[PDB]
Amino acid sequence: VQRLTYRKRHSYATKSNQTRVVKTPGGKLVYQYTKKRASGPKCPVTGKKIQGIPHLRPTEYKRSRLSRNRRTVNRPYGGVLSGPAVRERIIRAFLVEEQKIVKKVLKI
Amino acid sequence: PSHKTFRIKQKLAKKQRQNRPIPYWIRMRTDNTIRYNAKRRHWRRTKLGF
Amino acid sequence: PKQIHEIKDFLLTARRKDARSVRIKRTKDAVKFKVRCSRYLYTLCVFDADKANKLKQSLPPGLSVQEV
Amino acid sequence: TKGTGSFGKRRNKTHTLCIRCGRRSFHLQKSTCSSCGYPAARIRKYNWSVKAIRRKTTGTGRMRYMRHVPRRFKSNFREG
Amino acid sequence: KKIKAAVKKMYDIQAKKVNTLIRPDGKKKAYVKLTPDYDALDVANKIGII
Amino acid sequence: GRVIRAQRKGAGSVFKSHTHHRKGPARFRSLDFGERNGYLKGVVTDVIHDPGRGAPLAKVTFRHPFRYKHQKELFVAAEGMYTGQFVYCGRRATLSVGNVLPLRSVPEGGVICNVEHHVGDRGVFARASGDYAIVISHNPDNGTSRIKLPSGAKKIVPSSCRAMIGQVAGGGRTEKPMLKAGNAYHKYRVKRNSWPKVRGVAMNPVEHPHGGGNHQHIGHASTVRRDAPPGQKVGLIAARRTGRLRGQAAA
RNA sequence: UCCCGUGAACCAUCGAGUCUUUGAACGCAAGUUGCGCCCGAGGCCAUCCGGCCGAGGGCACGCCUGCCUGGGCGUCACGC
RNA sequence: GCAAAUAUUCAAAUGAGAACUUUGAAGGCCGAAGAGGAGAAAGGUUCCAUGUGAACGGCACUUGCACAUGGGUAAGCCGAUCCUAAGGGAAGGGGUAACCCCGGCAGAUAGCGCGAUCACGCGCAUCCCCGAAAGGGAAUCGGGUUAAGAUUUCCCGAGCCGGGAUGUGGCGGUUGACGGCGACGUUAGGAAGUCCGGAGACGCCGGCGGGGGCCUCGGGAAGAGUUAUCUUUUCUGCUUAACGGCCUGCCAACCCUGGAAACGGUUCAGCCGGAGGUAGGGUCCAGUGGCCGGAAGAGCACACGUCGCGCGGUGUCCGGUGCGCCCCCGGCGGCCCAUGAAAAUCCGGAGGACCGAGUACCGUUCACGCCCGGUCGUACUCAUAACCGCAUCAGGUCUCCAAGGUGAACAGCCUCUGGCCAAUGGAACAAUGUAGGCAAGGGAAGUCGGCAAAACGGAUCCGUAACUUCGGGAAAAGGAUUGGCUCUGAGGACUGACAGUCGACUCAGAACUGGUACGGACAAGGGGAAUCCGACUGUUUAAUUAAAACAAAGCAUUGCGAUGGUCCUCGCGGAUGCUGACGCAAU
RNA sequence: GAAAGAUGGUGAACUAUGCCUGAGCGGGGCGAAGCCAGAGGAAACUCUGGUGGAGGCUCGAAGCGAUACUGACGUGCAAA
RNA sequence: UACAGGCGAGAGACCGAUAGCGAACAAGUACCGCGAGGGAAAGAUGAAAAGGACUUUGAAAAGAGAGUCAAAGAGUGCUUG
């Protein structure tokens, strides 16, 4: 059944010391080390996930390592604000500006 | 330990070069009084303290 | 670790600088043409031996061909 | 308990080697040598231990440079 | 780096790769791999090791 | 004898405040031309729990007066404040809960919190949960006002001292029994090392004036004078009276 | 080869030299041969008549004399 | 005196000499929360080969963790190194007879940073260094190789990261690309000061679901074991890494149409809906999921045949199952007078100053191609002999992996992989011991005292008093049952009130049966009536005291509104205080 | 030949307490809020059966400790 | 005028290896303690190594003969003993 062993000299079971059991061509079972999970990007306005972007460990998003279509969403404020938050900001920007005149209409 | 510093590795190396019996010809020199190495060390009997 | 799908572009990529070799692994049911480039090892799997022989000849003389 | 059970728990070094004097007297947390007083510029020595003084005064090492001053004083420090 | 340079000035050869270790007794040892142009055995003969 | 527990606290060592998880100081924003002569509009963004404190904290985001950047302040939340609220600070601000106005702008009887004492000290009074002050009177020939503090005392403070309208949120907290040594333990873990407490009568004479004896008792009056040396001033310091409070003295 | 001479020597003596890493210890540190910056003889190509690897060598603090650069209606003169 | 940790025996080899070395056979043990395989600390050569007179290995030794002579630790990818935590040091200044002591006290604070150079401009805000081989974090996998190094440092193959350059091709100019109603998609798709957001980045508990590894069932081919009798039988193995594409798209989240009561959708639990449900159709997300490439050329197992890291051949399958175990993940729920790091680093956006061609120049986060990757550690033990305890000491010392049976069970007991039989031997079996049993009749008479021992003990059904803070007491007390064998019924899935096929598990019931045995070893409460103290949980005199002592919730008193109270300091100054009466301080 | 007294230094590798950052703790018993269904009721609400999984609750594995034998040992395996 | 340090001398009614400095010697050494610190023991063959070839017993260490020496019974911790 072949008990396993760590392959680094880090010997404690912290979150950084994550292992996966794999069966190699040599008939062996070994540990392999894995990433620790990251939450993905979030919209501050509603807290919800940002769509269209993978959930990776922050250096894994570097320009040299991930293609630009996986890093961006094609809308204003894209990948920073979700779609509904953009729609709300547009209407509020428009309406409040339209309210600025109708208060200035009162200046008589 | 396996993790050591270069400075500790350097001193441990010198301690090894000093655990050797004296050359036989030293015993033949004129007006000689050295009988044996009076400073030999064994890892299980005397610790280096460093 | 990067498979080619067509004889057309495989010829173009076996016709490159730093294409070091071409390996020919005759297998069951198929033949594999692997070209050793700088960054990647490209592979075609050919299914007609007639198209297999046709591919071999177009491999440009000089490009080290191994038969195993 | 104290004694044999408690002596089994020596695993952490209070002192290590000192760069200035070479003795295992550098207190890591306090970051000062208990023997020579490093990193204090002046050297730690007391008159209430004359024996500790004579273990480390001039002449107990090489005197790489001051060995030759007596010879240079005779001949009134001639420069060729 | 300097090991690579010095092996080209002396012995007029090329090192593909140099691996080093500081031996347990204090000296450094360098494993020099020759680029596949030169022949290590012929280099060994021209100085005398084998 | 030896240095007693009350004397050991002034050295700091293990008696310092436990503030690793705290969220920063809670106060007004530095008083400026905007707040002296008009009003500055802020939006509340979060209501957050501050470890070691019963009052919740409100993150208010203002827009900077003369720099192109935000200014992110942190208030002691008044009961009623909510995220998305626009709070207003200044001299011409309306009398609404959560607004910060100077006391010259507050009618007598108003309830106020986080009141300054010197103009610009950014809040010293009525800051614990469910606490408030009341404006009693104005004196316009001095620029000063009289307020009642939570303790009942009546302090004269300038008419420019700022305060937040309402009361500090989180009130009623101390009415709940704790029931457990464990609950007291978690309360003080995030405040300071003052719990539990060993009674001095249960100590030895070497470490406390009350210590020792074949029965646990004090043996001397427990009221000590105001001018007693440190290490001697333990018990009821400079007490004017003792015993159960009845009648007028309970008032 | 050092023996009727530039000439032996674990010789004496001292003027010419060398003097690793440190240490008051000085680029920042130090249970680290860890982490910067600057100059630069020498060599290579040209993405300039510049850039690339350089042998070596600098860069601590306080202070004095001089100097250079600069600040303030502190005191002025002269203007605008 | 050499007595804990179950245990040795037979042949042969070797040798001067064998109970103690070596090989083979047998008998046993650890029994995987191990006497197995690997590390952190600590040690420092104990590692490996060859040899060896003495000493040493509390008997012995041909032997060794001893002695002597040699050999052995290989990295752009593992670490350190970088960042900050609690905290430490610190320049000007303050104190000091001086050694020294003070870091927010605010000083042209150290460093200036960025665009520029062909010079100037802008901005300067809470600011330097150190501090983690378990926190945060650029990048690697599989197969081989030694007497001793490597699982990933060496060899073979295949990749990746960072920096530096530079070229070919491509892409855009409606100056700075297209498609989709949309969620969003396409591996290209201007941007300066300035500003903004996200990841990094976080507690404990509960259950539910998913993936990987393992275990478990049946079938097929290969080899072996048993074979007087049986047994289509029992055993062993039947493999596929990073990395690159394509598919798939969990549970959530999200989009579009539409308009819900006779309310519906839904979980183990919740919960959801005119602030838009059900429905219908899409997007995105995770993956340790599937296919191909890597890659069968590797590895393994067989069977052959040949002198010398030869060579040749056969194969490397098929379903199924889960309140199973390990790791990880998703998404809900609960708890808090407790709300459970920071920074480095990386990504995204707002704005748009300034910029170019179409004999062609301005570009470009695309593809391919070119170069380079420094320093130090790396052997070995990690403990009933390599660490500490004066020792090769029954002590102490932080972790990771974890098979079968019985069973609720990482209990105890037996077994496989792997590891051992190392604890000086021989003879005999007195007293007295020590450790472990059993004892007729009686049953605490013993004794200060039921000390010690015995009795009880699992599970299913039934039944359970006083008293009570109504939550308990309670497993109160008191009863009955329990093996094996042969049956019977119930409880399901999928596929096309049915038919077919499949299916691992639980519970009820009956007859038969035995020398009345059956939780058959193991494991595993004795119970009741009361008095005193302490409410409870918690803690305590390390090595004679575990308590009725301490603490505690609850109750009460005292001081203090900051120019304050309590306290520390030689002084400067500091703690409470990132605080302010629902607070701090003293009882 | 003291018990002491003083001056100046060295220790938190054991232990005490605070703070930071990590790791760990089977299988069972009891069954609180919330929630569903049925039944009773003018109402207020009650009753019955499930569901759910609270708690400085409970038997207990590892870990952590140390009551009793006032067992062994007491020139010990061991200064516990 | 002072002068337990430094260097360079010269002396003595001093000590004679348990004495004299702690140290006549690889002595502030070995060794101990986390540390500040603590801190030993240990001189003499012979005039000259001439330090015992060779034979024999023994696995060896060694023994018995022998050899050197004025002497080994002065035989490498060896004057006396």
Ligand SMILES: [Mg+2]
């Ligand atoms: Mg884990």
Ligand SMILES: [Mg+2]
């Ligand atoms: Mg995208």
Ligand SMILES: [Mg+2]
């Ligand atoms: Mg030891």
Ligand SMILES: [Mg+2]
């Ligand atoms: Mg003690």
Ligand SMILES: [Mg+2]
């Ligand atoms: Mg410890």
Ligand SMILES: [Mg+2]
């Ligand atoms: Mg310490």
Ligand SMILES: [Mg+2]
């Ligand atoms: Mg290296």
Ligand SMILES: [Mg+2]
């Ligand atoms: Mg406390």
Ligand SMILES: [Mg+2]
């Ligand atoms: Mg109290």
Ligand SMILES: [Mg+2]
């Ligand atoms: Mg108390």
Ligand SMILES: [Mg+2]
């Ligand atoms: Mg007491």
Ligand SMILES: [Mg+2]
């Ligand atoms: Mg007193």
Ligand SMILES: [Mg+2]
């Ligand atoms: Mg008393």
Ligand SMILES: [Mg+2]
């Ligand atoms: Mg008493």
Ligand SMILES: [Mg+2]
């Ligand atoms: Mg009295």
Ligand SMILES: [Mg+2]
């Ligand atoms: Mg005897």
